[PDB]
Symmetry: D2
Subunit: 233 residues, 4 copies
């Protein structure tokens, strides 16, 4: 068994790969998106962050896949007289992977057709006519910004959201859940995903987020703590 | 920190406290309720099982409460031309605690008024006019068979259900979730519970289950694996 | 895998089996032997303590043996103008097992010939002509008070000793080590032991200790913290 | 608490930083030093390997230090009619750290006076008049190839050695032990080390090894498995 486990209750940039607007505040928070400087979520911001060490999600010589679980607490805040956009997502991406489109694409996809060998659990705050369900949701994305399945998520501005995502090698079951300790509300989604089919044996694990590309559609995308655990074979 | 952690992928009666009809099959399964000829769920069956070592859930001298998480896989099967009844539940009970009423009371409650110092997460399969919601559900019970909160549970006969219950000391948040890997369906409930108020410092941890008290209302109540983890202070 | 893990940084009698003079101080310490009011270690004291839940060390149907590790901190104190006696030991004993002889037998053995199905790691403080090496030692005992192997242990009165015992199923290697953080001294012993041959599938895990049976040979035998971990199959 | 834990029972170069002659065999072994025309330890070889993600060993803002433990299995083999040289060592080094001198310096030190902010546990196989004890040993090195303390190590050619190194934040106690499951022999060393004084807050964790710089003094320096665990605050 080749295990890996880490838990960050305070972030620091030395063991993180930051891309674009991603940055770690002096207070130890992982801030995925910018500020127009005046303390307001910048428009058209895109930021990604990954753990500096690759994780082996599956082995092609033994044919085994890893089981994993991750939990993190994020906080999305929308400024007065503005709307949430575009969202935040946990993602398993190819090691050297570079950022993609802004806005509705969450920095993870193109809208083109290139195989992104990407799997992500998104927390969509803005409705996109072309592929999104009508209400804000939690979705499991497998190579497309069009979730393979979703669930209604009743977004609450400024409240800490606690997430738990788990993958089981045997059942190929991916389960994502979110709860607002303050609201005592909870949501859960689950579907089967075959990681061998879409992901490369080694992947970089992390977050990606974006703000709307239009003046009044912005939000902050901060992660306050994160823990990941993976067991292979 | 006084921790405890165990994981049983196969049960054996030597480190278990069995009550009434509870028993461990030769195949290592924890069978909470009886059977009879042919191999049918006996009517009016009641069985409880606990880990033979007490767990300290909170300390009155330091004022701290433990955080815990448990996960188990159960399988409820209803025989042809019969209906599910009455249910199964994970419960934290007083150490010497003895069984209570059958049927709708799940062997955990009376319907009287005695403080049972019991907290349980139930998986109710039968509707009880007097206190149950109309549909089958998952409920958090705090001293009463009348759940302090519930959620719709779409019961699937004969399919393995995977449960995850977690309690957080800081937020006093109890979260129970269930998923059917085969159906890819999931359900989640959450509410705040102050364990210091209702539970004694030391409790026995385990399961309780019953079958209907009427001819055509029976089911099997088997637990296939179980893991518990508790951290105090 | 049927795992078990616990860690006590403060003892309490509700999840412990105490035998004879064993007791838990108000300060949360496991005191294996008595005191005589004058504050001095009683003469001819014998006390044993075990975790209230049996542990499965091996399975005769699958032929597998468990790997385990335990660590604890003990403190032996000798009163002025007196000598250490008789010792302290960590032991895996049969579930219902009752105490044996006092003094040099550490409460674990007879000197007769009954198979005790006992395995213990002793911390011998008194020399017994008949079977002990000349100097104080750490010894691995397999069914006899005559250690199957030992190592010189330079006893330091009143200083906290930190112990680590580990057993590996594959290599059948038992390794015991002790260190005095204050003295920066360390000792280690290792030998192979086939647990299937001497131990019953289920055992009670714990400590045993005694004081000399002669006026000026006494000591305190206190355990300050304890953690055990076992993985089967 | 900012934790980190990994366990490699088979190495792969994608999550490793390899320096000089270090390499990962097709069979998944971390081979620190080179070979020859045929499996002959090359002369004057030097190789180092670290985990690709920095580890935070202490925080200067909170003043806390991390506790850690690592265990690995290495195998040193000397070719017929040749002698062991120079040794192998586990080390905590500065993040960008580059290799140092060959031979007796184990690739970790200079013999000059530059502060290397390095701490290592060495497994010295060759006697160096100037600073080494007469017999082969295990030594704790704090900024100098001259160990701050050592212990006799009875080297056994070609046998797998199992190592366990642990550091305790509270007692500042570093304890290194080695055992030869096949020989049933064991060795242990312990001394206090203040990591804040010598190490930078973030360090790269890994191995370093070298072979003699003279024709008949060579050995292989292979690590077969490795697990590291660190807990900060
Ligand atoms: C990360 O740790 C280094 C340690 O020197 C410190 O200088 C830096 O400020 C830290 N960054 C944050 C965001 O805490
Ligand atoms: C439980 O263990 C006992 C003793 O080893 C054995 O007799 C019994 O068959 C076991 N039960 C199961 C289900 O393995
Ligand atoms: C252990 O807990 C019980 C119940 O809370 C209490 O009565 C007892 O005094 C405790 N024992 C010690 C030694 O603290
Ligand atoms: C390292 O991983 C790659 C796959 O990403 C594989 O081709 C290579 O064989 C691996 N090396 C070892 C020693 O397992
Ligand atoms: Ca969207
Ligand atoms: Ca009911
Ligand atoms: Ca003796
Ligand atoms: Ca040397
Ligand atoms: Mn969406
Ligand atoms: Mn109900
Ligand atoms: Mn002895
Ligand atoms: Mn040396």
């Amino acid at each position: 068994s080749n295990d890996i486990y880490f838990n960050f209750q305070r972030f620091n940039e030395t063991n993180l790969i930051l891309q674009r607007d991603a940055s770690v505040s002096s207070s130890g928070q992982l801030r995925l998106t910018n500020l127009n400087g005046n303390g307001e979520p910048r428009v058209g911001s895109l930021g990604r962050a990954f753990y500096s060490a690759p994780i082996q999600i599956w082995d092609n010589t033994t044919g085994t896949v890893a089981s994993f679980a991750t939990s993190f607490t994020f906080n999305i805040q929308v400024p007065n007289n503005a709307g949430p956009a575009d969202g935040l997502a946990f993602a398993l991406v190819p090691v050297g992977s570079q950022p993609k489109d802004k806005g509705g694409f969450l920095g993870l996809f193109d809208g083109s057709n290139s195989n992104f060998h990407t799997v992500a659990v998104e927390f969509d705050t803005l409705y996109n006519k072309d592929w999104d369900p009508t209400e804000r949701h939690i979705g499991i994305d497998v190579n497309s910004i069009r979730s393979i399945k979703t669930t209604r998520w009743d977004f609450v501005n400024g409240e800490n959201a606690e997430v738990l995502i788990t993958y089981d090698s045997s059942t190929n079951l991916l389960v994502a859940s979110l709860v607002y300790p303050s609201q005592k509300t909870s949501f859960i989604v689950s579907d089967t995903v075959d990681l061998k089919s879409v992901l490369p044996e080694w992947v970089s694990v992390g977050f990606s987020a974006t703000t709307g590309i239009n003046k009044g559609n912005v939000e902050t995308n901060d992660v306050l703590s994160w823990s990941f655990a993976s067991k292979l074979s």
